[PDB]
From a paper:
The Gcn5-related N-acetyltransferases (GNATs) are a very large enzyme superfamily with more than 10,000 members identified across all kingdoms of life. The GNATs catalyse the transfer of an acetyl group from acetyl CoA to the primary amine of substrates including antibiotics aminoglycosides, glucosamine-6-phosphate, histones, serotonin, spermine, spermidine, and other small molecules.
Here, we describe the 2.15 Å structure of a GNAT family member within S. aureus. Two central antiparallel β-sheets (β1–4 and β5–8) are splayed between β4 and β5 to create a V-shape in the protein. This signature feature of GNATs is stabilised by hydrogen bond interactions between water molecules and the amide N and carbonyl O atoms from the protein main chain. SaGNAT is likely to exist as a dimer based on the crystal structure, structural similarity with homologous proteins, and elution profiles from size exclusion chromatography. In the asymmetric unit of the crystal, two SaGNAT molecules were present with a buried surface area of 1,397 Å2, strongly suggesting that this interaction is biologically relevant.
Author numbering:
A (entry chain A), C (entry chain A): -2 to 162
B (entry chain B), D (entry chain B): 1 to 162
Write the structure that this text describes.
Amino acid sequence: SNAMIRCAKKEDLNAILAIYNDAIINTTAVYTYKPQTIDERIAWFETKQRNHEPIFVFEENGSVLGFATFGSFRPWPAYQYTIEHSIYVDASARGKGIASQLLQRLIVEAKAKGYRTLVAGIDASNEASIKLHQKFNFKHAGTLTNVGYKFDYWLDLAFYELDLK
Amino acid sequence: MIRCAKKEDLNAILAIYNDAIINTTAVYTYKPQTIDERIAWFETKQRNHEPIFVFEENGSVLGFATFGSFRPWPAYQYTIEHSIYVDASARGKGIASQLLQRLIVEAKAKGYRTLVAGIDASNEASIKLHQKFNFKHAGTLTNVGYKFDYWLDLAFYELDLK
Amino acid sequence: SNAMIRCAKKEDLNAILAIYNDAIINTTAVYTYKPQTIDERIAWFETKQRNHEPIFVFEENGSVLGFATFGSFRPWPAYQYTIEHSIYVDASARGKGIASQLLQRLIVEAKAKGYRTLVAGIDASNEASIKLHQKFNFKHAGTLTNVGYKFDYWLDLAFYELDLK
Amino acid sequence: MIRCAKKEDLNAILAIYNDAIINTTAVYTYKPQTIDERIAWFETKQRNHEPIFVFEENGSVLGFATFGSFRPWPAYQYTIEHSIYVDASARGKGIASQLLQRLIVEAKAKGYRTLVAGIDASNEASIKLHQKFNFKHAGTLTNVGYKFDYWLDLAFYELDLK
């Protein structure tokens, strides 16, 4: 039972890709329709590396079972102390507290880099994610109704926020 | 008259925008925009077929308005975020209201479902205006911005276009 | 500026009544239609006294500007460590932090009496109350839709909860 | 057969109820009910015109069900909370489902808007049953109950009767 949270590396990308694409195909966790390609994912990784944005993976028994990152919330200079994060856990690996460990690590990194405000965009249907965020003292800041459309129904996006100060 | 913006409008638009940058929390930016960035913005919007409207009176552009993507993921397809800016010397004339009205007309015509405004929590006139046009307060993100040495709260207001 | 939070007394009831009835007439803060009578309010007070349930008032310059209490959440013996509270502030006295001071006092009393769980039933429209409760680390536990009917529209009741442990 | 309960049913009902008190988290009560309290409950429900249904088979009451007030304030007028109890020896027979079906029929006929179930978070069969009848999980209150030396979570499930 060799389990560890570490920064992601290039050799992780394929695993990461699979996880992400599963989420695209089966859930509203990603407001995307088409599976991402490996080149798109590699460009994403290189861009995160250039921007000094973290990517963490949860790895167990040689397998990447989850990943997490943060970056810009809205693209305007005065949002500089605000970041938005995302967390994805393999569907075969749920119930193991992997999301919780990833979020914990994200928060420690966010505090160490001096950000003020951490934002989660969570689909209103994502009950486990909402519960997890409430556990870490995120406050529900609002809900934008009918902002998304997927699987033939309208989607509501809830914003949760943590004051890192 | 409210008409679509043309390249010849750009300088005036820039001025309005930069005033808002320098003096208000209406734009979460610190440094003035340059005319080159504005021109690039214009051409990009022409390319994306996003509308830009100006309010013109006595040959002078007194306000402008536009809408575009709210968040950049494909499933946000039917959601747009709008922006309105009115010349500081042209307040009180109902310009922002006429622009918002025009934006809403354009948004319905193009088949969008949801129109979103990010309004600074202190912009009470804008809030009152959007309430008047039946926008609902969707929420408020606190301390999301930082300008003029203080923390800024962003209120989200939404209109269902259906 | 003589301001104080104290336990309520009989001589407070008239003031309390007015506040309550204002809330009945103008808001969804009380799922009641008809104004309460002074005898009903006195019976309420006597009952709270018999049950050792607290009633606090915020008093300033000789005037009761707010009141607050807690009691049973659901009537079955196994809910004994759970209480539900309510807070009412005079409409002429809003924005003074009176609700916040009352809630603070309620929480200290709840902890001192060994309860585990404090519950707020808040109308989904009551934004100030929701914000106040989030401030004191209540978690939104759920929302019952169309449970109430008042002023010709359907009402949603949100539950917020604080773990007192 | 599912019929309205009669006084002669009460003893059987009591047994069922008390079993649930003694062995499960289905009733947030510690001590067995007495037949006097049950009779008072029955007469009170007759008075309030609240329905009580029993599932009867081979002359034996194998389950019962009822609904009544959810919260005690006038504006909760169109909301009811229901309860279903099935004999422990009569599980697997679809009794709870037939009772719920009957309750829903009765609730619509009487013009209620919202039907509410308080279900212990560990009662997975009840949850699955209510999901089957299109109840929505409205929320969960954690640590609201205490029984058998542990903390209990109450899930609320709701059906819009319109």
